[PDB]
Protein backbone atom coordinates (compact mmCIF):
# COMPACT_ATOMS: atom_id res chain seq x y z
CA UNK A 399 0.00 0.00 0.00
CA UNK A 400 2.90 2.32 -0.84
CA UNK A 401 1.87 5.86 -1.73
CA UNK A 402 4.08 7.94 -4.01
CA UNK A 403 4.09 11.73 -3.79
CA UNK A 404 5.65 13.74 -6.61
CA UNK A 405 6.77 17.33 -6.42
CA UNK A 406 6.26 19.72 -7.90
CA UNK A 407 2.70 18.99 -9.05
CA UNK A 408 2.90 21.65 -11.76
CA UNK A 409 5.85 23.44 -13.38
CA UNK A 410 7.08 25.50 -16.31
CA UNK A 411 10.59 25.10 -17.64
CA UNK A 412 12.51 27.51 -19.84
CA UNK A 413 14.26 26.02 -22.90
CA UNK A 414 17.58 24.51 -21.84
CA UNK A 415 16.75 24.85 -18.16
CA UNK A 416 17.57 21.83 -15.94
CA UNK A 417 14.54 20.00 -14.55
CA UNK A 418 14.22 17.69 -11.56
CA UNK A 419 11.14 15.71 -10.58
CA UNK A 420 11.10 13.99 -7.19
CA UNK A 421 9.02 11.00 -6.13
CA UNK A 422 8.86 10.04 -2.45
CA UNK A 423 7.47 6.80 -0.99
CA UNK A 424 5.74 5.83 2.26
CA UNK A 425 8.00 2.78 2.23
CA UNK A 426 11.21 1.59 0.59
CA UNK A 427 11.24 0.41 -3.00
CA UNK A 428 13.98 -1.46 -4.84
CA UNK A 429 13.45 0.53 -8.05
CA UNK A 430 11.39 3.36 -9.48
CA UNK A 431 9.80 3.61 -12.93
CA UNK A 432 8.72 6.72 -14.82
CA UNK A 433 6.08 7.40 -17.44
CA UNK A 434 5.57 10.38 -19.74
CA UNK A 435 2.02 11.15 -20.82
CA UNK A 436 1.24 13.82 -23.39
CA UNK A 437 -2.30 15.30 -23.86
CA UNK A 438 -4.76 13.00 -25.61
CA UNK A 439 -2.37 10.03 -25.63
CA UNK A 440 -1.61 6.89 -23.63
CA UNK A 441 1.27 6.89 -21.16
CA UNK A 442 4.65 5.90 -22.51
CA UNK A 443 7.40 4.12 -20.56
CA UNK A 444 10.28 6.59 -20.13
CA UNK A 445 12.65 5.30 -17.46
CA UNK A 446 12.63 1.79 -16.00
CA UNK A 447 14.50 0.14 -13.15
CA UNK A 448 15.36 3.55 -11.73
CA UNK A 449 17.80 4.80 -14.36
CA UNK A 450 17.50 2.83 -17.60
CA UNK A 451 16.17 4.96 -20.47
CA UNK A 452 13.37 3.30 -22.47
CA UNK A 453 13.10 3.13 -26.26
CA UNK A 454 13.39 6.46 -28.11
CA UNK A 455 14.15 8.33 -24.85
CA UNK A 456 16.81 11.11 -25.26
CA UNK A 457 20.07 11.11 -23.29
CA UNK A 458 19.31 14.43 -21.64
CA UNK A 459 17.00 12.28 -19.50
CA UNK A 460 18.17 10.35 -16.42
CA UNK A 461 16.83 8.86 -13.21
CA UNK A 462 18.25 8.22 -9.75
CA UNK A 463 17.61 7.50 -6.09
CA UNK A 464 16.84 4.64 -3.74
CA UNK A 465 15.01 3.76 -0.57
CA UNK A 466 12.09 6.15 -0.42
CA UNK A 467 13.29 9.08 -2.54
CA UNK A 468 13.76 8.99 -6.30
CA UNK A 469 14.09 11.55 -9.04
CA UNK A 470 13.89 12.13 -12.76
CA UNK A 471 16.03 14.79 -14.37
CA UNK A 472 16.15 16.57 -17.72
CA UNK A 473 19.56 18.19 -18.13
CA UNK A 474 18.35 20.64 -20.81
CA UNK A 475 14.64 21.31 -21.36
CA UNK A 476 13.27 20.75 -24.86
CA UNK A 477 9.81 21.47 -26.27
CA UNK A 478 9.43 17.74 -26.98
CA UNK A 479 9.71 17.05 -23.23
CA UNK A 480 6.58 18.96 -22.22
CA UNK A 481 4.13 16.46 -20.70
CA UNK A 482 2.88 14.94 -17.46
CA UNK A 483 5.27 12.57 -15.75
CA UNK A 484 4.36 9.74 -13.38
CA UNK A 485 6.57 7.54 -11.21
CA UNK A 486 5.74 3.92 -10.43
CA UNK A 487 6.90 1.20 -8.05
CA UNK A 488 6.41 -2.53 -8.52
CA UNK A 489 8.61 -3.48 -5.62
CA UNK A 490 5.58 -4.27 -3.44
CA UNK A 491 2.01 -5.23 -4.33
CA UNK A 492 -0.14 -3.42 -5.06
CA UNK A 493 1.83 -1.50 -7.70
CA UNK A 494 1.20 2.25 -7.47
CA UNK A 495 1.76 5.48 -9.45
CA UNK A 496 2.67 8.92 -8.19
CA UNK A 497 0.37 11.93 -8.06
CA UNK A 498 1.96 13.12 -11.29
CA UNK A 499 3.88 16.20 -12.46
CA UNK A 500 2.46 18.40 -15.24
CA UNK A 501 5.50 19.91 -16.98
CA UNK A 502 4.83 22.68 -19.51
CA UNK A 503 7.40 24.34 -21.73
CA UNK A 504 7.87 28.12 -21.53
CA UNK A 505 7.79 29.97 -24.88
CA UNK A 506 7.65 33.41 -26.49
CA UNK A 507 4.55 35.35 -25.44
CA UNK A 508 1.78 34.98 -28.02
CA UNK A 509 -1.40 37.02 -28.30
CA UNK A 510 -4.60 34.99 -28.75
CA UNK A 511 -6.41 34.85 -32.07
CA UNK A 512 -10.01 35.69 -31.10
CA UNK A 513 -12.91 34.48 -33.27
CA UNK A 514 -16.57 35.09 -32.48
CA UNK A 515 -19.61 33.45 -34.09
CA UNK A 516 -23.30 34.34 -33.85
CA UNK A 517 -25.85 31.54 -33.27
CA UNK A 518 -26.46 29.32 -36.29
CA UNK A 519 -29.82 29.51 -38.05
CA UNK A 520 -30.23 25.84 -37.11
CA UNK A 521 -29.99 26.36 -33.36
CA UNK A 522 -32.27 29.39 -33.59
CA UNK A 523 -34.95 27.26 -35.27
CA UNK A 524 -34.63 24.94 -32.27
CA UNK A 525 -35.31 27.80 -29.89
CA UNK A 526 -31.85 28.14 -28.37
CA UNK A 527 -29.15 30.77 -28.86
CA UNK A 528 -25.50 29.90 -28.23
CA UNK A 529 -22.89 32.58 -28.97
CA UNK A 530 -19.38 31.13 -29.28
CA UNK A 531 -15.89 32.58 -28.99
CA UNK A 532 -12.48 31.02 -29.64
CA UNK A 533 -9.27 32.31 -28.08
CA UNK A 534 -6.77 30.26 -30.05
CA UNK A 535 -3.01 29.71 -29.76
CA UNK A 536 -1.83 32.04 -26.98
CA UNK A 537 0.77 31.97 -24.22
CA UNK A 538 1.07 32.21 -21.28
CA UNK A 539 -1.97 30.25 -20.01
CA UNK A 540 -3.32 33.10 -17.91
CA UNK A 541 -6.07 34.61 -20.02
CA UNK A 542 -9.34 36.14 -18.86
CA UNK A 543 -12.49 36.25 -20.98
CA UNK A 544 -15.47 38.55 -20.49
CA UNK A 545 -18.76 38.73 -22.36
CA UNK A 546 -20.41 42.08 -23.03
CA UNK A 547 -23.95 42.37 -24.36
CA UNK A 548 -24.68 45.93 -25.47
CA UNK A 549 -21.84 47.15 -23.26
CA UNK A 550 -22.68 45.32 -20.05
CA UNK A 551 -20.83 42.39 -18.51
CA UNK A 552 -22.48 38.97 -18.60
CA UNK A 553 -21.57 36.25 -16.07
CA UNK A 554 -24.21 33.49 -15.84
CA UNK A 555 -24.67 31.15 -18.78
CA UNK A 556 -20.98 31.24 -19.68
CA UNK A 557 -19.30 27.82 -20.12
CA UNK A 558 -15.52 27.81 -20.56
CA UNK A 559 -13.16 25.16 -21.89
CA UNK A 560 -9.35 25.18 -21.81
CA UNK A 561 -6.94 22.95 -23.71
CA UNK A 562 -3.55 21.80 -22.45
CA UNK A 563 -0.30 22.97 -24.04
CA UNK A 564 -0.36 22.06 -27.74
CA UNK A 565 2.49 19.92 -29.07
CA UNK A 566 2.54 21.73 -32.40
CA UNK A 567 3.34 25.26 -31.21
CA UNK A 568 3.36 25.09 -27.39
CA UNK A 569 0.33 27.39 -27.03
CA UNK A 570 -3.01 27.25 -25.22
CA UNK A 571 -6.51 27.55 -26.62
CA UNK A 572 -9.75 28.44 -24.92
CA UNK A 573 -13.35 28.25 -26.00
CA UNK A 574 -16.10 30.25 -24.32
CA UNK A 575 -19.76 29.57 -24.99
CA UNK A 576 -22.61 31.84 -23.91
CA UNK A 577 -26.00 30.16 -24.12
CA UNK A 578 -29.19 32.21 -24.06
CA UNK A 579 -32.83 31.68 -25.01
CA UNK A 580 -33.75 32.89 -28.51
CA UNK A 581 -35.80 35.52 -26.63
CA UNK A 582 -32.94 36.97 -24.55
CA UNK A 583 -30.57 36.93 -27.52
CA UNK A 584 -32.95 38.93 -29.73
CA UNK A 585 -33.56 41.35 -26.87
CA UNK A 586 -30.07 42.67 -27.50
CA UNK A 587 -28.05 44.05 -30.42
CA UNK A 588 -24.28 43.85 -29.78
CA UNK A 589 -22.26 40.84 -28.56
CA UNK A 590 -18.63 41.13 -27.59
CA UNK A 591 -15.91 38.71 -26.50
CA UNK A 592 -13.29 40.47 -24.37
CA UNK A 593 -9.96 38.84 -23.58
CA UNK A 594 -7.30 40.28 -21.28
CA UNK A 595 -3.83 38.85 -21.84
CA UNK A 596 -0.33 39.92 -20.75
CA UNK A 597 0.42 40.54 -24.44
CA UNK A 598 -1.70 43.68 -24.44
CA UNK A 599 -2.34 46.57 -22.05
CA UNK A 600 -5.85 46.89 -23.43
CA UNK A 601 -8.30 44.00 -23.91
CA UNK A 602 -8.27 42.09 -27.19
CA UNK A 603 -11.86 42.23 -28.40
CA UNK A 604 -14.14 40.88 -31.09
CA UNK A 605 -17.84 41.53 -31.60
CA UNK A 606 -20.73 41.27 -34.02
CA UNK A 607 -24.02 43.07 -34.48
CA UNK A 608 -27.13 40.90 -34.68
CA UNK A 609 -28.61 41.53 -38.14
CA UNK A 610 -31.94 40.69 -39.78
CA UNK A 611 -31.70 38.94 -43.16
CA UNK B 612 3.44 -4.87 -34.38
CA UNK B 613 2.07 -5.02 -30.84
CA UNK B 614 -1.55 -3.95 -30.52
CA UNK B 615 -3.85 -3.71 -27.51
CA UNK B 616 -7.44 -2.58 -27.89
CA UNK B 617 -9.90 -1.90 -25.07
CA UNK B 618 -13.67 -1.68 -25.36
CA UNK B 619 -16.86 -2.34 -23.45
CA UNK B 620 -16.66 1.17 -22.08
CA UNK B 621 -19.72 3.37 -22.04
CA UNK B 622 -22.57 4.59 -19.85
CA UNK B 623 -23.38 2.41 -16.86
CA UNK B 624 -25.86 2.89 -14.01
CA UNK B 625 -24.56 3.23 -10.42
CA UNK B 626 -24.47 -0.07 -8.57
CA UNK B 627 -24.48 -2.11 -11.76
CA UNK B 628 -21.76 -4.11 -13.51
CA UNK B 629 -19.68 -3.56 -16.61
CA UNK B 630 -17.18 -5.85 -18.27
CA UNK B 631 -14.30 -4.35 -20.24
CA UNK B 632 -12.34 -6.12 -22.96
CA UNK B 633 -8.84 -5.93 -24.39
CA UNK B 634 -8.09 -7.73 -27.62
CA UNK B 635 -4.38 -8.24 -28.29
CA UNK B 636 -2.03 -9.44 -31.01
CA UNK B 637 1.59 -9.29 -32.12
CA UNK B 638 2.88 -11.57 -29.34
CA UNK B 639 2.14 -14.87 -27.57
CA UNK B 640 -0.58 -13.83 -25.12
CA UNK B 641 -0.13 -16.68 -22.62
CA UNK B 642 3.57 -15.87 -22.10
CA UNK B 643 2.73 -12.47 -20.60
CA UNK B 644 1.26 -10.86 -17.49
CA UNK B 645 -1.39 -8.18 -18.18
CA UNK B 646 -2.26 -5.14 -16.07
CA UNK B 647 -5.27 -2.88 -15.88
CA UNK B 648 -4.87 0.83 -15.22
CA UNK B 649 -7.39 3.64 -15.03
CA UNK B 650 -7.26 7.41 -15.10
CA UNK B 651 -10.27 9.53 -14.14
CA UNK B 652 -10.53 12.70 -16.32
CA UNK B 653 -7.93 15.26 -15.28
CA UNK B 654 -6.57 13.01 -12.51
CA UNK B 655 -3.63 10.67 -11.83
CA UNK B 656 -3.13 7.13 -13.07
CA UNK B 657 -4.26 4.32 -10.78
CA UNK B 658 -3.10 0.71 -10.97
CA UNK B 659 -6.05 -1.66 -10.55
CA UNK B 660 -4.27 -4.98 -10.77
CA UNK B 661 -2.75 -7.64 -12.98
CA UNK B 662 -3.05 -11.31 -13.93
CA UNK B 663 -0.09 -13.61 -14.50
CA UNK B 664 0.97 -15.87 -17.39
CA UNK B 665 0.58 -19.66 -17.81
CA UNK B 666 3.90 -20.47 -16.17
CA UNK B 667 2.62 -18.66 -13.10
CA UNK B 668 -0.89 -20.12 -13.05
CA UNK B 669 -2.76 -17.05 -14.30
CA UNK B 670 -2.94 -15.77 -10.75
CA UNK B 671 -4.27 -12.30 -9.96
CA UNK B 672 -3.16 -9.45 -7.72
CA UNK B 673 -5.42 -6.46 -6.93
CA UNK B 674 -5.31 -2.84 -5.84
CA UNK B 675 -6.82 -2.17 -2.40
CA UNK B 676 -9.50 0.18 -3.72
CA UNK B 677 -11.05 -2.55 -5.87
CA UNK B 678 -10.34 -5.89 -4.20
CA UNK B 679 -13.71 -7.61 -4.05
CA UNK B 680 -15.55 -5.54 -6.66
CA UNK B 681 -13.26 -5.99 -9.64
CA UNK B 682 -12.11 -9.26 -11.14
CA UNK B 683 -9.51 -9.67 -13.84
CA UNK B 684 -9.70 -12.65 -16.15
CA UNK B 685 -8.37 -13.66 -19.53
CA UNK B 686 -9.61 -15.87 -22.36
CA UNK B 687 -6.39 -17.44 -23.55
CA UNK B 688 -8.27 -18.93 -26.51
CA UNK B 689 -9.14 -15.64 -28.16
CA UNK B 690 -6.15 -13.86 -26.53
CA UNK B 691 -8.51 -11.44 -24.73
CA UNK B 692 -8.02 -9.79 -21.32
CA UNK B 693 -11.09 -8.85 -19.22
CA UNK B 694 -12.05 -6.65 -16.30
CA UNK B 695 -15.31 -7.33 -14.44
CA UNK B 696 -16.53 -4.29 -12.47
CA UNK B 697 -19.32 -4.72 -9.92
CA UNK B 698 -21.24 -2.28 -7.73
CA UNK B 699 -19.88 0.60 -9.82
CA UNK B 700 -19.65 4.06 -8.27
CA UNK B 701 -18.98 7.49 -9.77
CA UNK B 702 -15.35 7.25 -8.64
CA UNK B 703 -15.11 4.47 -11.21
CA UNK B 704 -15.80 6.92 -14.06
CA UNK B 705 -12.59 7.04 -16.06
CA UNK B 706 -10.48 5.89 -19.00
CA UNK B 707 -9.29 2.29 -18.56
CA UNK B 708 -6.14 0.93 -20.18
CA UNK B 709 -4.86 -2.63 -20.42
CA UNK B 710 -1.09 -2.96 -20.42
CA UNK B 711 1.22 -5.82 -21.34
CA UNK B 712 2.99 -6.50 -18.05
CA UNK B 713 6.12 -8.68 -17.50
CA UNK B 714 6.83 -11.62 -19.78
CA UNK B 715 8.80 -14.87 -19.67
CA UNK B 716 11.99 -13.11 -20.74
CA UNK B 717 14.41 -10.37 -19.80
CA UNK B 718 12.98 -7.80 -22.15
CA UNK B 719 12.65 -5.39 -19.23
CA UNK B 720 12.71 -2.29 -21.41
CA UNK B 721 9.46 -3.78 -22.71
CA UNK B 722 7.64 -4.23 -19.40
CA UNK B 723 4.65 -1.91 -18.98
CA UNK B 724 5.65 -0.34 -22.31
CA UNK B 725 2.58 -1.34 -24.37
CA UNK B 726 -0.76 0.32 -23.63
CA UNK B 727 -4.09 0.28 -25.42
CA UNK B 728 -5.73 3.54 -26.50
CA UNK B 729 -8.10 3.21 -23.56
CA UNK B 730 -11.87 3.01 -23.19
CA UNK B 731 -14.11 5.54 -21.43
CA UNK B 732 -16.47 4.31 -18.72
CA UNK B 733 -19.10 6.68 -17.37
CA UNK B 734 -20.96 5.83 -14.17
CA UNK B 735 -24.11 7.92 -13.93
CA UNK B 736 -27.86 7.68 -13.54
CA UNK B 737 -28.33 10.44 -16.13
CA UNK B 738 -29.98 9.38 -19.40
CA UNK B 739 -28.27 9.09 -22.79
CA UNK B 740 -28.95 11.86 -25.32
CA UNK B 741 -27.76 12.56 -28.89
CA UNK B 742 -25.88 15.77 -29.74
CA UNK B 743 -27.21 18.72 -31.70
CA UNK B 744 -24.52 19.81 -34.15
CA UNK B 745 -24.31 23.46 -35.15
CA UNK B 746 -21.95 25.12 -37.66
CA UNK B 747 -19.86 28.13 -36.75
CA UNK B 748 -19.38 30.54 -39.64
CA UNK B 749 -18.04 34.11 -39.21
CA UNK B 750 -20.37 37.10 -39.07
CA UNK B 751 -18.78 39.30 -41.75
CA UNK B 752 -11.90 37.08 -46.25
CA UNK B 753 -11.03 39.75 -43.70
CA UNK B 754 -7.64 38.05 -43.30
CA UNK B 755 -5.41 35.41 -44.89
CA UNK B 756 -6.66 32.80 -42.44
CA UNK B 757 -10.30 32.24 -41.58
CA UNK B 758 -11.32 30.14 -38.57
CA UNK B 759 -14.42 27.93 -38.64
CA UNK B 760 -16.10 25.81 -35.99
CA UNK B 761 -18.68 23.24 -34.95
CA UNK B 762 -20.86 23.34 -31.85
CA UNK B 763 -21.71 19.95 -30.32
CA UNK B 764 -24.05 20.42 -27.37
CA UNK B 765 -26.54 18.63 -25.16
CA UNK B 766 -25.26 15.08 -25.46
CA UNK B 767 -24.60 12.35 -22.90
CA UNK B 768 -22.33 10.78 -22.15
CA UNK B 769 -18.82 11.25 -23.46
CA UNK B 770 -17.19 10.66 -25.75
CA UNK B 771 -17.81 12.08 -29.21
CA UNK B 772 -15.36 12.26 -32.06
CA UNK B 773 -14.96 15.31 -34.29
CA UNK B 774 -13.12 15.32 -37.61
CA UNK B 775 -12.90 17.75 -40.51
CA UNK B 776 -13.17 16.76 -44.18
CA UNK B 777 -13.17 13.06 -43.27
CA UNK B 778 -9.87 13.65 -41.51
CA UNK B 779 -8.15 15.11 -44.57
CA UNK B 780 -8.05 18.22 -42.37
CA UNK B 781 -6.05 17.58 -39.22
CA UNK B 782 -3.85 20.66 -39.37
CA UNK B 783 -5.10 23.82 -37.71
CA UNK B 784 -7.75 21.85 -35.83
CA UNK B 785 -8.67 22.56 -32.22
CA UNK B 786 -11.03 20.37 -30.26
CA UNK B 787 -11.72 21.70 -26.79
CA UNK B 788 -12.53 19.36 -23.86
CA UNK B 789 -16.21 18.81 -23.16
CA UNK B 790 -17.91 20.69 -20.33
CA UNK B 791 -20.76 19.13 -18.38
CA UNK B 792 -23.76 21.17 -17.28
CA UNK B 793 -27.05 19.84 -15.89
CA UNK B 794 -26.45 16.22 -16.95
CA UNK B 795 -25.56 17.40 -20.49
CA UNK B 796 -22.22 17.74 -22.31
CA UNK B 797 -21.19 20.53 -24.67
CA UNK B 798 -18.04 20.85 -26.79
CA UNK B 799 -16.71 22.83 -29.71
CA UNK B 800 -14.09 22.39 -32.41
CA UNK B 801 -12.33 25.03 -34.47
CA UNK B 802 -10.39 24.71 -37.70
CA UNK B 803 -8.20 27.31 -39.35
CA UNK B 804 -7.73 27.27 -43.09
CA UNK B 805 -6.45 29.82 -45.59
CA UNK B 806 -9.04 32.30 -46.85
CA UNK B 807 -8.22 30.97 -50.30
CA UNK B 808 -9.53 27.38 -49.76
CA UNK B 809 -12.78 28.60 -48.22
CA UNK B 810 -15.46 29.14 -49.16
CA UNK B 811 -13.94 27.56 -52.26
CA UNK B 812 -13.36 23.89 -51.51
CA UNK B 813 -15.89 23.12 -48.73
CA UNK B 814 -15.25 22.48 -45.04
CA UNK B 815 -17.30 19.91 -43.13
CA UNK B 816 -17.09 18.60 -39.58
CA UNK B 817 -18.08 15.00 -38.92
CA UNK B 818 -19.42 14.14 -35.51
CA UNK B 819 -20.02 10.69 -34.13
CA UNK B 820 -21.65 9.75 -30.83
CA UNK B 821 -21.40 5.94 -30.38
CA UNK B 822 -23.44 5.90 -27.15
CA UNK B 823 -26.40 7.22 -29.13
CA UNK B 824 -25.34 5.57 -32.41
CA UNK B 825 -25.55 9.08 -33.80
CA UNK B 826 -23.34 10.25 -36.66
CA UNK B 827 -23.91 13.43 -38.66
CA UNK B 828 -22.07 15.72 -41.08
CA UNK B 829 -22.32 19.50 -41.21
CA UNK B 830 -21.11 21.54 -44.14
CA UNK B 831 -19.93 25.00 -43.14
CA UNK B 832 -21.81 27.52 -45.26
CA UNK B 833 -20.80 31.21 -45.07
CA UNK B 834 -22.98 33.86 -43.41
Ligand SMILES: Cc1ncc(COP(=O)(O)O)c(CN[C@H](C)C(=O)O)c1O
Pocket residue numbers: 428429430447487488489490644663667712713722723
Ligand atom coordinates in the same frame (compact mmCIF):
# COMPACT_ATOMS: atom_id res chain seq x y z
C1 LIG C 1 5.91 -5.51 -14.53
C2 LIG C 1 6.16 -6.41 -13.35
N1 LIG C 1 5.27 -7.42 -13.11
C3 LIG C 1 5.38 -8.32 -12.08
C4 LIG C 1 6.44 -8.25 -11.18
C5 LIG C 1 6.50 -9.29 -10.06
O1 LIG C 1 6.11 -10.59 -10.58
P1 LIG C 1 5.57 -11.68 -9.54
O2 LIG C 1 4.70 -10.95 -8.58
O3 LIG C 1 4.93 -12.80 -10.33
O4 LIG C 1 6.83 -12.28 -8.84
C6 LIG C 1 7.42 -7.20 -11.35
C7 LIG C 1 8.63 -7.02 -10.42
N2 LIG C 1 8.88 -5.61 -10.01
C8 LIG C 1 10.37 -5.30 -9.90
C9 LIG C 1 11.06 -6.25 -8.91
C10 LIG C 1 10.54 -3.82 -9.47
O5 LIG C 1 10.35 -2.80 -10.28
O6 LIG C 1 10.88 -3.72 -8.16
C11 LIG C 1 7.27 -6.27 -12.45
O7 LIG C 1 8.18 -5.30 -12.62
